[PDB]
Amino acid sequence: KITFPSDIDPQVFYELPEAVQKELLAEWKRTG
Amino acid sequence: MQIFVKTLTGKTITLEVEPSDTIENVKAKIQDKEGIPPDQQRLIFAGKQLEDGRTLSDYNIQKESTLHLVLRLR
């Protein structure tokens, strides 16, 4: 289950590298 | 040569640049248009992080090329 902020689009997100993907997901999780 | 920059929200921007333009310059372009500073915006091309000490031709970027912008925290 993935939750994206009101300012994040999923189409451009999956297009980003995994290493950067994890850092962005870890940020939405630490605060999420 | 121009390049398209898609943001995390899907915002696409076309900025005219040159094969000898430095990554630090392209970043400034998004700053004057998106109002985002260089110390927080990140440009990635083909899963590679662009360095502020190189030129577009050094990363093999050509016209109509598209890059991805990742926001930092600061």
From A1's Cα to the closest Cα of chain B, the distance in A is 19
From A15's Cα to the closest Cα of chain B, the distance in A is 8
Q: Tell me how far apart the alpha carbons of residues B59 and B28 are, in angstroms, rounded to a whole number.
A: 18
- Is the Cβ pair A12, B73 closer than 8 Å? no
Assign residue B7 the CATH number of its domain: 3.10.20.90
DSSP B49-66: EPPTTSBGGGGT--TTEE
Solved using: NMR
Domain count, chain B: 1
Query: What domain range includes position A21?
Result: 1-32
- Reduced 3-state DSSP string for A2-26: CCCCCCCCHHHHCCCCHHHHHHHHH
Candidates B70, B72, B74, partner chain A, best to mutate (most A CBs within 10 A): B70
Distance in Å from the first CA to the final CA of chain A: 12
- Name the residue among B7, B70, B73 with its Cβ closest to that of A20: B70
Domain count, chain A: 1
Query: What domain range includes position B34?
Result: 1-74
Residue labelled with tokens 């997100």: A13
